[PDB]
């Protein structure tokens, strides 16, 4: 008739200890920014990652998270946190999306088609426009071929449209790929400056190093609980194991390709993970007319 899954009783999170914090500020308040062609890519590693500071800032024009649920950001652990700060026009914000093609997308900065992370774009028109002209921000609109994902091209290559090189001088079929943005306070959406920070995440089998704040409740051995040991979430019973893991890592597995044994971010104790007791239930009954006892 039915199964008998031994429902879990408690929950244990054992995220490793660092109890520090993230740059997450100098990648968002930074007085000055970068170009889209020349975009600062900073690797945030070793952190606690309190995404509350992001919500503490100004409202975001397009706070779109592709690979990760925006509300579930703090719960999961990520290996490397990347800050990519640059300024692009408002109508070009939509071009920053996996699987979407466009001039800014293909000739300036191409996100991977399977990108996992969050794009945080907010209007910064409060203080970006100067009477002299915001020629500092630049973008590339010509390149020999399409850019590979996560590629940067800052060199000024002489655009050789014709069959003869332009030789670094102006003339027919001789145009500079770089174009300077024109930022005016009175211009509507589409030409106004927009500050865009791309949070690139990489889920893989190395230590989290960056994992939204969660305090580890103590361990519970012989019992049936959830475990969250550096991002691997599951259900099982934690028991002392005689396996001798080499210092490499903790993700112990068996022939069944299942997480048999794991090491905790406290002692290097190795605990074998066994599934919580379960089975199928069967009802032995006589004929219904004979009796109703089962």
């Amino acid at each position: 008739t039915s199964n008998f899954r031994v429902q879990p009783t408690e929950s244990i999170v054992r995220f490793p200890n660092i109890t520090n914090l993230c740059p997450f500020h100098e990648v968002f308040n930074a007085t000055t920014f970068a170009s889209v062609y020349a975009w600062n890519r900073k690797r945030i590693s070793n952190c606690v990652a309190d995404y509350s500071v992001i919500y503490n800032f100004a409202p975001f024009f397009a706070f779109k998270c592709y690979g990760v649920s925006p509300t579930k950001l703090n719960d999961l652990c990520f290996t490397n946190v990347y800050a990519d700060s640059f300024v692009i026009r408002g109508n070009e914000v939509s071009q920053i999306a996996p699987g979407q093609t466009g001039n800014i997308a293909d000739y300036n900065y191409k996100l991977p088609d399977d990108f996992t992370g969050c794009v945080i774009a907010w209007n910064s028109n409060k203080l970006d426009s100067k009477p002299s002209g915001n020629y500092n921000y630049l973008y590339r609109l010509l390149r020999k071929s399409k850019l590979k994902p996560f590629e940067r091209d800052i060199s000024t290559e002489i655009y050789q449209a014709g069959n003869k090189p332009c030789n670094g001088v102006a003339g027919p079929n001789c145009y500079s790929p770089l174009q300077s943005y024109g930022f005016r306070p009175t211009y509507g959406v589409g030409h106004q400056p927009y500050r865009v920070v791309v949070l690139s995440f990489e889920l893989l089998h190395a230590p989290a190093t960056v994992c939204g704040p969660k305090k580890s409740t103590n361990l519970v051995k012989n019992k049936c609980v959830n475990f969250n040991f550096n991002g691997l979430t599951g259900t099982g019973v934690l028991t002392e194991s005689n396996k001798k893991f080499l210092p490499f890592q903790q993700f112990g597995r068996d022939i069944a390709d299942t997480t048999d044994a794991v090491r905790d971010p406290q002692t290097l104790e190795i605990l074998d993970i066994t599934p919580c007791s379960f089975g199928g239930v069967s009802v032995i009954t006589p004929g219904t007319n004979t009796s109703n006892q089962v």
Partner: peptide, 11 residues
């Protein structure tokens, strides 16, 4: 060399 940081026994 070890392909990954995953432990294995008698496999």
């Amino acid at each position: 060399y070890y392909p990954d940081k995953v432990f294995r026994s008698s496999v």
